[PDB]
DNA sequence: GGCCGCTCAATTGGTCGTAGACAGCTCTAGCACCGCTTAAACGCACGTACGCGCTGTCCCCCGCGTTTTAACCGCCAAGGGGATTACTCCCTAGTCTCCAGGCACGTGTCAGATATATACATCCTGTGCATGTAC
């Protein structure tokens, strides 16, 4: 989360950085799964094929 | 040229025996559950202390009503990739057998890490204040 904050041009850890920590690593992502993060949002995903040619 | 006469190879009908698998025992034995304790801690009833959640009027970017269009929806017919089903042989799944060995449980007694009485102390939570990060 602190690396996600520092990479995304910030320093104060907030729920978005926790969602970025959880969803970039498959073993956090399977451990938490269907649980939800207050104002963490969803990990960036403009879907393939819908991304224009 | 046609139909029925004697024989014997043929479906179609009731008791014997078994085996699965409950059903109800048919007890019976044992181990939990019930009984009637002795007892004390959590819950209620009770009030008390108070944020906290309802309910009042302000005010802007958001909600919502109409504009063309262009790419997406979905149709229609082509068209060729490929799934089903035809059929027989082949082989390994089923089945039960049985061994002999491992190891799950039984079950015995010993003993050590745990609960807990109570005695310490330092750990880390509410409030305040200093000041800098995301907007």
From Swiss-Prot:
It is involved in the initiation of both imprinted and random X inactivation. Ubiquitinated H2A is enriched in inactive X chromosome chromatin. Ubiquitination of H2A functions downstream of methylation of 'Lys-27' of histone H3 (H3K27me). H2AK119Ub by RNF2/RING2 can also be induced by ultraviolet and may be involved in DNA repair. Glutamine methylation at Gln-39 (H2AQ104me) by FBL is specifically dedicated to polymerase I. It is present at 35S ribosomal DNA locus and impairs binding of the FACT complex. The modification N6-succinyllysine is found at residue 30. The modification N6-glutaryllysine is found at residues 30, 53. The modification N6-(beta-hydroxybutyryl)lysine is found at residues 30, 53. The modification N5-methylglutamine is found at residue 39. The modification N6-crotonyllysine is found at residue 53. The modification N6-(2-hydroxyisobutyryl)lysine is found at residues 9-10, 30, 53. It is found in: Nucleus; Chromosome. Core component of nucleosome. Nucleosomes wrap and compact DNA into chromatin, limiting DNA accessibility to the cellular machineries which require DNA as a template. Histones thereby play a central role in transcription regulation, DNA repair, DNA replication and chromosomal stability. DNA accessibility is regulated via a complex set of post-translational modifications of histones, also called histone code, and nucleosome remodeling. Belongs to the histone H2A family. The nucleosome is a histone octamer containing two molecules each of H2A, H2B, H3 and H4 assembled in one H3-H4 heterotetramer and two H2A-H2B heterodimers. The octamer wraps approximately 147 bp of DNA. This is Histone H2A type 1-B/E. It comes from Homo sapiens. The chain holds residues 67 to 119 of 130 of the full protein.
């Amino acid at each position: 989360a602190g690396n996600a904050a520092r990479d995304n041009k910030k320093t104060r850890i907030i729920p978005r950085h926790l969602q970025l920590a959880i969803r970039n690593d498959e073993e956090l992502n399977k451990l938490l799964g269907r649980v939800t993060i207050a104002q963490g949002g969803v990990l960036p995903n403009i879907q393939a094929v819908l991304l224009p040619k």
